Every structure is written in C-alpha cells, then in structure tokens.
Amino acid sequence: IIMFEDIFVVDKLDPDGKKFDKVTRVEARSHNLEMFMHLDVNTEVYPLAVGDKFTLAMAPTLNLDGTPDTGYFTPGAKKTLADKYEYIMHGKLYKISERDGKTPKAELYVSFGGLLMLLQGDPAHISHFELDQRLFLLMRKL
C-alpha cells in the first residue's frame, strides 16, 4: 500500500530557469502534515512552476499486494500493476540523520539513482523507513 502520502506546494526553485540542461532543486512543504521536500527533478521533460499542487507516495513495491519484492530489472506488465501516477522513480535509501533544537528535525536522505531528496519533519511520520531499503517515488501533478 502507501507508507507515506502528502500534498505539497512548490515554494522556490534553485536554478529558477528554463532549458538549462540541468536538474532543478524544487523545494516544497506540506500544509496538513508539516513536511519539507527537496526533490531534484528536471523541468524539461516534466514542467513544474512556482506554486502548484501534486501528490507524492512512497511504496516499497509496485505489485499491489501481489509480490513482496520488485524482481528483475525490466519489469513487464503483469496483473494490473500500479500505473495511476505520472512520475514514477526508483532508488535506495542510504542515510537516516536526526537533529536537535526543534521537535520536527528528523530528516531523511534518499537517492533515486544520481539525484537526491531530503525529507525533514517530525519522527512520527518517517518512523516506518529502515536503512538500505529499496523504495519508490510515485508522483502525479493535478
């Protein structure tokens, strides 16, 4: 199923341009669960603007309760897999760090290949994530 689901809003872009042949550090924050997104995504193939609405999910598998693992590299279509989203990524978690000073200071470091993503928030929501886990990044702009 879904381990974490939220609706964010684009705050600021770090390059803040168009057709820069690079990746944009799209900073986002929640409004109902007090989260913070730092996902890198290129604007050329997936256009994002300052101020929008998009849902984000994070599941350990895409078989929809049919298999507890991913499987091979090239996964064929089998038994109506979860394809309702538009932006699907894959990556492995590598670092879980905490911080003092505030209650919502537990960050989350994940790498979807060569990109990076920071998830700073309270430790109650990201408590279900272990170390060296194979996660997914389901996203859909609405």
Binding site: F73, E86, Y87, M89, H90, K92, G114, L116
Partner: protein, 189 residues
Amino acid sequence: LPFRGDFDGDCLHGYVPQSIQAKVELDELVALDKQLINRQNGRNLLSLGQDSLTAAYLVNVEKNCYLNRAQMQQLQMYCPFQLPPPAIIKASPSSTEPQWTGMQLFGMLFPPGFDYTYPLNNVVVSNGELLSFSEGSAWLRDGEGNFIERLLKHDKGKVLDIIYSAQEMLSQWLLMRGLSVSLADLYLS
C-alpha cells in the same frame, strides 16, 4: 603516463631477452602488474588519460540525459559487471520505456562491496554504486584520495581490467555525444 611522452613523433626503444633467467625476472619485478605503486609520490601510477577523464567528468556532471534500454545493454558488454535496476520507471506521460540514469551508468566499474567516500566532492559509494555528486573533479585524476588508489587498496588483482573497461566503454559513450570546439566556444558570448 609513466613514459611521459606523446604521439607527436616519439620513438620507443625495445630490448628483447633471450635467457630464461632474464625472462622470468621480467614478469616478476619489472612488468606492469608489479610496479603499480608510484614510489616517488606514494600513490597510483596509471591514472586516467585525456578522453577518459573528460568522459568520466561529463557522465557525472551532465545529469540530464536519459538513455533508454536500447543503448544501455550495448555498453554493458565492455564492463564485466551486470546491469543495475532502472532508477526511472516513468519520467513523463509521453515516455513509456524505463530510462536509465547517467550516474547509474558509472556504477558498472565499481565491484560489489566497494566503499569509498570523498568529503570535498560529497560522493558516496555504497555497495558498488555511487549515490551522490555535487561539483567535483578532484577524485578522478592524480590527487590525494581517488577511486583508483582505493581500488588498488581493495583487491589489487583486476585494476588493469577496470581501467581498461573504464576506457573502452567511456570512449563509446563519448562517441554518442561528440566533443567539438566551435567558434562559439572561442566567442564565449
């Protein structure tokens, strides 16, 4: 690079042995698989060349090329390791095939079990797959801490089979992109 010469007309002297006592001693103390440590500096001797250094830079700095599974399995033949799983399943609604990542292509040279961390370039290599990169080029050439010396300290048995596949694959990758100096490069405007 040990010869310190280019291909603009330099010659090479060749001495041939005849005795067995001069033949067994050549592949024991003199040959390239034995003097892999440059004892003048205390580090690696055979670093990256001119094309391989630029290709290993561009692969990890460009970050905005998504090659599909058609031109990925062709580059998996020059490397002795298998293919990683695709980090991108669907980057766009107008895209169907799972496209790979440029930094995921550089993980076909590090063996499973390689641990390497460089703090000045923020690159972390965990279980034979690099995961981070932010504006660095010092961990590739002859510096203080680089992946060639960390591979020579890891196993020291197949480093000459690693730098060879780090050239015969990076050349075929750079042929697909093309490096050319045009007039707009001198104009800089």
